[PDB]
Amino acid sequence: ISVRGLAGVENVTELKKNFNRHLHFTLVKDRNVATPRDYYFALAHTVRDHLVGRWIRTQQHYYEKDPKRIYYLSLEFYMGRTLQNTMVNLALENACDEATYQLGLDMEELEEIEEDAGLGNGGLGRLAACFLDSMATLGLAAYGYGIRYEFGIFNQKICGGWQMEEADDWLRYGNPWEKARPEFTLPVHFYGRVEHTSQGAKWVDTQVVLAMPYDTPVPGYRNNVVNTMRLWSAKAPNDFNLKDFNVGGYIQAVLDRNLAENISRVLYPNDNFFEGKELRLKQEYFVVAATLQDIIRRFKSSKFGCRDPVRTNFDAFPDKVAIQLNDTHPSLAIPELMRVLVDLERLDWDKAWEVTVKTCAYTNHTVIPEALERWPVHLLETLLPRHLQIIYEINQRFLNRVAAAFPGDVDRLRRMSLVEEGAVKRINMAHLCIAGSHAVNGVARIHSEILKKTIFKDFYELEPHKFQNKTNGITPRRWLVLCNPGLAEIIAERIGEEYISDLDQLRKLLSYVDDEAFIRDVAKVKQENKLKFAAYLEREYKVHINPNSLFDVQVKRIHEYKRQLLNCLHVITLYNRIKKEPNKFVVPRTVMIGGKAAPGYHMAKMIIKLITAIGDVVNHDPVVGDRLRVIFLENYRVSLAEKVIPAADLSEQISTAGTEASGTGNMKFMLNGALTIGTMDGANVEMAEEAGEENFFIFGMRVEDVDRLDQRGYNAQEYYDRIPELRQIIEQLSSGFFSPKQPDLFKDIVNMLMHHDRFKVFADYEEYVKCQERVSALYKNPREWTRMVIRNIATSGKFSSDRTIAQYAREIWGVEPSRQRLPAPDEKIP
Amino acid sequence: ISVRGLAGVENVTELKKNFNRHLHFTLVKDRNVATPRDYYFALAHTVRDHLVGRWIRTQQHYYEKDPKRIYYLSLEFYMGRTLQNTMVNLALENACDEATYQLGLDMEELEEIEEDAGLGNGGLGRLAACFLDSMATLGLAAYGYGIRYEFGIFNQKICGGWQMEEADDWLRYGNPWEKARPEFTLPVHFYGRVEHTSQGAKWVDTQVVLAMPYDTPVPGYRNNVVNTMRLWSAKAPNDFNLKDFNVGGYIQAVLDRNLAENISRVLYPNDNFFEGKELRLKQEYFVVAATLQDIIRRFKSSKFGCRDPVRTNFDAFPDKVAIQLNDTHPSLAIPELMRVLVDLERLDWDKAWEVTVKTCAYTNHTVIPEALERWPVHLLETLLPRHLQIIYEINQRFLNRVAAAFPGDVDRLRRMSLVEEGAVKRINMAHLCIAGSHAVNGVARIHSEILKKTIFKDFYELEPHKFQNKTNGITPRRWLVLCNPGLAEIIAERIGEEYISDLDQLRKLLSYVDDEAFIRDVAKVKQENKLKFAAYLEREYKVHINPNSLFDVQVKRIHEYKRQLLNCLHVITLYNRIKKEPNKFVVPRTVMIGGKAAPGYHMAKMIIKLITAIGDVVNHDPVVGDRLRVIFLENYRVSLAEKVIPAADLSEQISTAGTEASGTGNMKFMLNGALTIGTMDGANVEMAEEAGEENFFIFGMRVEDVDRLDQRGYNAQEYYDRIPELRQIIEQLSSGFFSPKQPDLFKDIVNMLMHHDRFKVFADYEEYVKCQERVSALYKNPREWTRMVIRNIATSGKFSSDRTIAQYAREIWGVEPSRQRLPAPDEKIP
Numbered sequence A, B: 001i002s003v004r005g006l007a008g009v010e011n012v013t014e015l016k017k018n019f020n021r022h023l024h025f026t027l028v029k030d031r032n033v034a035t036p037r038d039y040y041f042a043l044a045h046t047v048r049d050h051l052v053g054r055w056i057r058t059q060q061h062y063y064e065k066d067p068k069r070i071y072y073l074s075l076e077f078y079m080g081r082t083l084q085n086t087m088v089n090l091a092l093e094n095a096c097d098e099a100t101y102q103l104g105l106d107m108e109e110l111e112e113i114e115e116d117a118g119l120g121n122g123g124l125g126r127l128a129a130c131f132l133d134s135m136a137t138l139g140l141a142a143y144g145y146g147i148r149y150e151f152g153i154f155n156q157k158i159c160g161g162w163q164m165e166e167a168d169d170w171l172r173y174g175n176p177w178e179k180a181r182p183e184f185t186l187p188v189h190f191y192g193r194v195e196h197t198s199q200g201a202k203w204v205d206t207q208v209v210l211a212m213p214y215d216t217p218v219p220g221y222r223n224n225v226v227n228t229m230r231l232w233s234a235k236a237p238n239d240f241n242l243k244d245f246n247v248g249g250y251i252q253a254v255l256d257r258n259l260a261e262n263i264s265r266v267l268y269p270n271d272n273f274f275e276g277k278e279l280r281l282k283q284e285y286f287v288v289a290a291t292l293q294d295i296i297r298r299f300k301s302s303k304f305g306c307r308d309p310v311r312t313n314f315d316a317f318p319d320k321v322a323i324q325l326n327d328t329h330p331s332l333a334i335p336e337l338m339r340v341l342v343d344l345e346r347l348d349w350d351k352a353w354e355v356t357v358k359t360c361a362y363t364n365h366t367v368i369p370e371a372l373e374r375w376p377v378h379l380l381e382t383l384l385p386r387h388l389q390i391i392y393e394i395n396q397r398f399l400n401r402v403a404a405a406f407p408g409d410v411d412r413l414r415r416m417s418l419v420e421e422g423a424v425k426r427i428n429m430a431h432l433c434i435a436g437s438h439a440v441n442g443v444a445r446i447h448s449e450i451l452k453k454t455i456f457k458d459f460y461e462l463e464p465h466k467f468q469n470k471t472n473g474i475t476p477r478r479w480l481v482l483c484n485p486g487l488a489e490i491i492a493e494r495i496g497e498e499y500i501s502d503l504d505q506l507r508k509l510l511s512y513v514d515d516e517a518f519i520r521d522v523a524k525v526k527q528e529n530k531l532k533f534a535a536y537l538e539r540e541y542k543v544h545i546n547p548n549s550l551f552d553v554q555v556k557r558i559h560e561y562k563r564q565l566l567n568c569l570h571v572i573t574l575y576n577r578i579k580k581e582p583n584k585f586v587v588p589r590t591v592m593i594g595g596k597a598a599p600g601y602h603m604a605k606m607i608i609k610l611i612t613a614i615g616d617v618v619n620h621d622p623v624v625g626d627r628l629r630v631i632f633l634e635n636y637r638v639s640l641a642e643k644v645i646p647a648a649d650l651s652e653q654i655s656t657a658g659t660e661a662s663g664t665g666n667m668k669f670m671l672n673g674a675l676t677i678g679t680m681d682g683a684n685v686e687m688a689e690e691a692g693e694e695n696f697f698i699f700g701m702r703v704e705d706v707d708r709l710d711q712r713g714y715n716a717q718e719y720y721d722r723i724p725e726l727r728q729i730i731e732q733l734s735s736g737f738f739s740p741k742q743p744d745l746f747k748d749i750v751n752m753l754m755h756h757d758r759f760k761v762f763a764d765y766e767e768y769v770k771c772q773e774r775v776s777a778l779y780k781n782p783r784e785w786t787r788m789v790i791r792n793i794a795t796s797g798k799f800s801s802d803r804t805i806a807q808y809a810r811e812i813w814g815v816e817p818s819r820q821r822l823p824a825p826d827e828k829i830p
């Protein structure tokens, strides 16, 4: 059937009876009233049974051996569905497929019923998920720590061409994967004041919110390791949230508990944008405070909570603990670790600071200013008074370091301060992370260099040793074996299965680049993938596409820096050229644009409307026929990505050079047989470098050119003046060609494009359509297109998150990865 | 060990491995980290497994045979713990005891970990629970329908002698008994307006709240019948509760969902008191609207949703459906049933009314005016506009009936109206229930007569056939076999086990009233019970009592009509007599008073303070010694009741004649070997009548005497003037003898007692202490006390809820009870 494992005789039988046990005993249903949703749950529970045994021994193991623990703190974990992924990592896919078949059910139909765990916005959240899978696969004692939002990223609905947001109640029917651990509930403080008494400061008169943990299993790939993702939920204490007496109302007091519990209710839908709301800051301290107590507790036990030197010496803390800050979101972990060590454990400042710097590491994910976290001091002052005091003291000491290193450099001092003066004083979270971490890293080679040369130049001059790079990657498991079994099988037919956990081995496919059967096969799976997606489209969304055309897709969050608008300009150009010479042949294309816009991002929502507006015109023009279709992919999410990416021919990664930190979608397309058209931005550079620029479609300004243009001054009118085709499009938008009933509908886009384009869309227009002509030319030659595809796939190995994690492990965390199978799952009950 | 069933070889082994399966697979724990709470859950899950098989076949059975269905609507279901009860009804107690013993665990210790399902206030809620158990035991196709509050009756804490209320988060660790059924979620409407168009009225522009059902199993006693209790939970729709666009905030919209979900958040803590809050009215319509849709759906399928006459003829509705209104709380079911039949199904008014009256029945539980539900019209007008219109039309037609029957009786017309004019117009819910039901019943013979003679006299003259009586009862399972296995065993040793489901057989114990061994045994179990309670007391609450003294207990909600104050007056009298003649012998007593006061009931909370104040003085007076102890039983609830009642010698049922509708605690004490001192009120009359007045300690005014006194006018000063002992107590309270630091602390009590005592406490004082002397005299003669006890126990059979339900079944619902074992639980998987 494929190498989705063995469909053993004893195990298919075993699976079937357990499926039935659960349908009866767990779901309390009988075959005569069971619906597909019930069947999905029976299976889910049956599969989950197979990893509890391993989950328990993995955790017990780490307790016995006591290795250095890795704590990945992130406010986002974009997990997606977990049924198939679990089957894949446990080699259970074919057995389950067989068994459910024998029970007369279609497994694929059941898999479609599982709701996505959308606890993320985009790249940042998905990176965390990929990392977790890799850390488990490489046998690291790692823990993912985050917030269990009851409402994840909103589900997007297109009404009249506009995006409509609606609550993502992903828990409505329950989550069979999580395990509530109310017994490990912890208290988290807010507000209050600071008392300075005799021997130390005291954080007093605080409001208490309880953090209840929920553990979800993270299985490694076929190695019997099952790590843990611990998500915190906010709960109100039953005392003060009722007991602070003297009139108000008993009923009202009980209803008001949903005020402390609102902390974990919803994820902020902002991608690469900072909103200084109090609720967000509360979420940030909440995850940090709860997690740290859990970390220290585990450390207090270790082998120190037995003997060792005997005296809670936190000197070995950094040798046993490593906490990674996914962006500045969990940045309060720094002053919080200090508060506990100094205020509660009573360590002197300097010893505490040494420990803190040695255990914390920070990862930066963007250079755009509006995404930078700068919290107003009056907010921290009210909500976390002691932390503010600690931050000021950290700043005081750090700046003294600077003064000593650069005597008399008074501007450098203000530039480097963690405290920003002006309208309202703010705390630069990024500056805090750099000062309190022993390593700072970018997510792509160019991004990392940009940090050193630009944004964090002064900090680099101060401590050059802190700055590193760790190019992002994706998991070959979910992003290849899971979503594209067809491609995985044909690769395995030639080079084996060891590449799934050693992606570099894909290089061996280079020697099949002239193999006639392989070229035919690679081309076949892609055709099968396109046919399946074209079908899904009519199934779930309804109104035809042509599977023979080139599948041109751009799927990622809607942003001005991602330039979906530049993609739009090209689409309209194709249309206009067709309308000019109707009877001239052109390579057919289905351009699919999908992504979500943050609710308050007006421009982004305007762009979504533009895309659907273009499709209204283009898709109903008889002269165009089936040569050009414009489709907006609704509710883009992880599960939808697993469907489009394997069916894509052209991947669009056209951000303005220097704005996309790394990107990861690009890597997903490369490993799945799509050719890439893009700019020398983020990881695109390393991808072209790995596959050879001849096998990549690069165009546009490089970072240097962008800067040259900024010195000069960017004037879009120039481009409008010298390119008639560009002029024609802008006047089409301006006159209502794309919006008849509301002719001035797109005035904001045009106005922006002509007067305040921060991402110089026009500057890359000419070179973009010129480059687009080149890919069309090559698509006309199936054999050569596929051969270039094989050059990309065969060379994408470097982009596996296993590589990324192994680097973090060795160069930052100080631990050694291991592909050693944990001693089976085997029963056991001590 | 006792007749807690057989501890079979095959089943103890089976139990043990399933206990282990769950500890591993369900709880995801290993013996080395498992806590008593984990062990409790493993067991709970193991026991729950045994009744799913029966639950499924019972429900399937009713679907096949299609009998008349009974729907018990109540806003309260005081269930208590459910582990032991389930073991008892499934004959699993000894097997579980053995198995857990073999696993090295104490079952009793684990049972103490289960949280009480406190979804009730007192008697009314507990009656519903007892009824459910009886309906399942008598093989009736009955369904309990209510609200799944996430916060039940508050947990009571005594701080400085005052009651402190704190949220009862009973779901904190989860509920292993319930089964969420998100797939049967239903929509419920609120607000909106009424459109009168061509062919009918339309309820339009409403706010939608979703009702998600949770089913809990209700096993009959050893008959394999497992009925269902369906509790509704409020959920916000994800559309409008987000989709009603045009600025407000996406985050805020999501946080505001906890506005529609507040409907099922907390139970109103009022016992016998009406609070006209909007949230309450919403809860009332919520449970009614959701339930009715469920009822009709089931009816539409029946055997009509196949064939029968073919044409949705609702003429057979009353033959297939019976809905019982537990008090007026679910009274909206009447106009709601009309709204659906008329507005949606399009039946003419008269046919709809005939159906409605024929399927609904109402049970009244109190005669005090302040407990009567009178909803302001402006509230119904805004929240349920169409229902108000229906109520007015029902009133219009009903009053025309009256006018026709009593021509010219203009005062009768206003008196009987469902609409009350005055300050603000109100709707008399009780009047609505009588008009729209074919049966109205009281809960005790005297209470029922009072309804006919007083409160509902006019309605009785109009339709005498509607009025009936159904004396309350309690379940011998939880209230005898479960809480008092020792007594149950010795009874079973002489007369067998058939009495558990046929309590009348207890009469056979009359012939052992002179049996020397039996008297010794009855006396022994009571001594063992007192020793165990005396121990629990020091265990969980701490500060000694004497097990040899007479256990004088009064446990019920704190009310002015229950007269805990009269009990107080007696206690103080005993104290004063001891202080007057210290070296004179008196029968030792431990008087235990326990109960909760509604949060806003100032007087009730003042009484709690008085009780603890008396104990402070009495319990620390050296001259008193161990002759007199005053203890306030904290957090009285079902589980606590199962502990005190079996250990009680004297039961206090001293409400003012004519105020306690029936009472059920009194019955609990009678069947557990306690002697009763009380007034001729509620069921006390039928109890004395059943056991013989010679075996009861009756005192005080009868209903007649109370009325005579009211004609005359009640003047408490008279009693104060003629009784020196009474005078001495009032002046002790007035001068601060019981409250040194705050001498005027109890001025409200004294003031009330002397000038506004609605329950004439002083009037029954003399006859009360005189009667108390008589019980002390009899306690001095152990042999005769026990013999009188045997006379009570042997004669309590009439007070089993099996009798009550059989009467409802035959005289109101029109169904026949059956003690037929359902065809085993046996596997099966169709």
Ligand SMILES: O=c1[nH]cnc2c1ncn2[C@@H]1O[C@H](COP(=O)(O)O)[C@@H](O)[C@H]1O
Residues within 6 Å of the ligand: A056, A059, A060, A063, A298, B030, B032, B033
């Ligand atoms: O005190 C202990 N005795 C034995 N095993 C322990 C103890 N503490 C932790 N463990 C084991 O280590 C696992 C790790 O628990 P953690 O504290 O959540 O990391 C637990 O599930 C147990 O298997």
Ligand SMILES: O=c1[nH]cnc2c1ncn2[C@@H]1O[C@H](COP(=O)(O)O)[C@@H](O)[C@H]1O
Residues within 6 Å of the ligand: A030, A032, A033, B056, B059, B060, B063, B298
């Ligand atoms: O359409 C049907 N076919 C077969 N069995 C049914 C059907 N509807 C209800 N049942 C059975 O009747 C039980 C009663 O379901 P209820 O509607 O919740 O009362 C179900 O759990 C099934 O066993």
Ligand SMILES: NN1C(=O)N[C@@]2(O[C@H](CO)[C@@H](O)[C@H](O)[C@H]2O)C1=O
Residues within 6 Å of the ligand: A121, A122, A123, A124, A125, A127, A271, A272, A273, A365, A366, A371, A443, A472, A660, A661, A662, A663, A664, A682
């Ligand atoms: N939202 N979001 C960011 O703020 N930064 C991002 O992080 C990911 C993961 O490192 C990078 O690949 C993206 O280029 C970057 O934009 C991202 O996706």
Ligand SMILES: NN1C(=O)N[C@@]2(O[C@H](CO)[C@@H](O)[C@H](O)[C@H]2O)C1=O
Residues within 6 Å of the ligand: B121, B122, B123, B124, B125, B127, B271, B272, B273, B365, B366, B371, B443, B472, B660, B661, B662, B663, B664, B682
């Ligand atoms: N709260 N509450 C009432 O409002 N009425 C009550 O109902 C129960 C059950 O019928 C009766 O036994 C009580 O006497 C009556 O007070 C009761 O306990």
Ligand SMILES: *Cc1c(COP(=O)(O)O)cnc(C)c1O
Residues within 6 Å of the ligand: A121, A122, A123, A126, A555, A556, A557, A636, A637, A638, A641, A662, A663, A664, A665, A666, A668
């Ligand atoms: C991989 C992924 C992303 C990141 O895409 P980029 O193109 O790097 O912005 C965003 N959303 C989803 C659902 C993803 O799978």
Ligand SMILES: *Cc1c(COP(=O)(O)O)cnc(C)c1O
Residues within 6 Å of the ligand: B121, B122, B123, B126, B555, B556, B557, B636, B637, B638, B641, B662, B663, B664, B665, B666, B668
């Ligand atoms: C039986 C019961 C009641 C009813 O007691 P009465 O004396 O009839 O008021 C109240 N509370 C609990 C916990 C009960 O078990």
